Design a protein around this ligand. Structure first.
Ligand SMILES: C#CCOc1ccc(/C=C2\SC(=S)NC2=O)cc1
Ligand SMILES: C#CCOc1ccc(/C=C2\SC(=S)NC2=O)cc1
Lengths: 259, 254
């Protein structure tokens, strides 16, 4: 194990800072969704009466949507915290840091949203709740189509059966993309990712020694992420016209602006 | 048992060299002779941004201030990597690691900032530049009173004439402070620090035999450090009442 030991140390570092940056890991999500407890069982929201009942322990479609955005802002904060811990990220040009976050934040958000999802719904409110897929689809349709692409991607992506130690390196690879529009110094970004991609390859080979070409399949999923992000920005462009009274968050505004 | 303390001292020094590019020996060679670009007024600041490379290059006083905090973010990552090298640190509770770092990064940032400072100014941009103390004082209020406390601390601290091998163990001692608010398991933290304090005592007695109680005086500097940190966050909230997106999330601390 020559220089593979450096990649193992990098994997462990990213995983340690992953746990320190995201309070709801995939491990805790799967322990809740399956039923490995009686204290971690979520309250299930599936209709109007179960929503009103679940509003004790933390318009209707507007309220759910605003709740989504706030969770998204919090997620951007956590991803920012995690990004600062990627070796070399804070040593890059400041403009490039803003750019990498601006275009990577949502690909990671949907990637990690898969961890909170099954084919039937998605965990909410730090895992205290669980909103069903059909209830989200039953919302008034501009809002009813917002979560279905995330659910379809999550079904296909959860089949890879990645744990948190894999996802830490994977989302690090997403942040350090040298093909982002408007980057000033691409070469250093590509060097960091070259290291992150090596680390991810080794981690997937050791953690999934039977998953043939899991590295390639995981890399191919980034295509689906792009498509998901595109459909979302279009959907937002519809909501901005239909709902002239709803407010989009400034942080979310700066991310999607001129994307 | 002293051989174990010496092994810990050498280990922490090698990790210190690996983690911090601009060491105190490097900085002091620059502050004596080896050729940094000097920033002494507004015009030399303009020419500095056009010739070197920085992190403050993106009112002038507000810009200088932000470059203090960006560098602090960069510094936090270097300090984080070094802390992970302290024996026993990674085996601690994860929440305790986050807490120790959260409350230690400031004291360490100023401790090591003293290594880049003399009575006349501070090195910047990995030693490529040197911003004068007078030009920092000439900044408009409240930004002109931001760095002067750090300079006054660095003078008294540098009078101790510590080197990198001393500062490595000293920083490690700061991290393992068992009195940080919110710690869940103080016992192993204080155990590691008890070992680090022994290593620091032996190091100072072997490296500065003419200084009788240098260990005691170095410990006395921590009160001055916590005053500098405590009084720094005050000017930081007043700074939050004088500066009104995605960039502000990157610098959510410092
Ligand atoms: C249309 C639409 C979007 O659907 C969603 C999906 C997930 C959430 C997550 C929540 S809500 C809450 S409270 N805490 C969370 O994490 C909210 C709305
Ligand atoms: C009032 C005020 C703030 O004064 C300072 C002091 C030090 C720095 C450090 C820098 S800036 C750079 S680039 N590289 C460094 O190490 C920046 C601003």
């Amino acid at each position: 194990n020559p220089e593979s030991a450096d990649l193992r140390a990098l994997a462990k570092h990213l995983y340690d800072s992953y746990i320190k940056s995201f309070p709801l890991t995939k491990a805790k999500a799967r322990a809740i969704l399956t039923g490995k407890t009686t204290d971690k069982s979520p309250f299930v929201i599936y209709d109007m009466n179960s929503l009103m009942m679940g509003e004790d322990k933390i318009e209707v479609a507007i309220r759910i949507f605003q709740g989504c955005q706030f969770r998204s802002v919090e997620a951007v904060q956590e991803i920012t915290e995690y990004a600062k811990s990627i070796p070399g990220f804070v040593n890059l040009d400041l403009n490039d840091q803003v750019t990498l976050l601006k275009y990577g934040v949502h690909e990671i958000i949907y990637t990690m949203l898969a961890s909170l999802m099954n084919k039937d719904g998605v965990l909410i409110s730090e895992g205290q709740g669980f909103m069903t897929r059909e209830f989200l689809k039953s919302l008034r349709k501009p809002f009813g189509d917002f979560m279905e692409p995330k659910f379809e991607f999550a079904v296909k992506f959860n089949a890879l059966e990645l744990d948190d130690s894999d996802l830490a390196i994977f989302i690090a690879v997403i942040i350090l993309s040298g093909d982002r529009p408007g980057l000033l110094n691409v070469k250093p970004i590509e060097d960091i990712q070259d290291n992150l991609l090596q680390a991810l390859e080794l981690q997937l080979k050791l953690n999934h020694p039977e998953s043939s070409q899991l590295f390639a399949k995981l890399l191919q999923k980034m295509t689906d992420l792009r498509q998901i992000v595109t459909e979302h920005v279009q959907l937002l462009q519809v909501i901005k016209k239909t709902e002239t009274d709803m407010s989009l968050h400034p942080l979310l505004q700066e991310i999607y602006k001129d994307l």
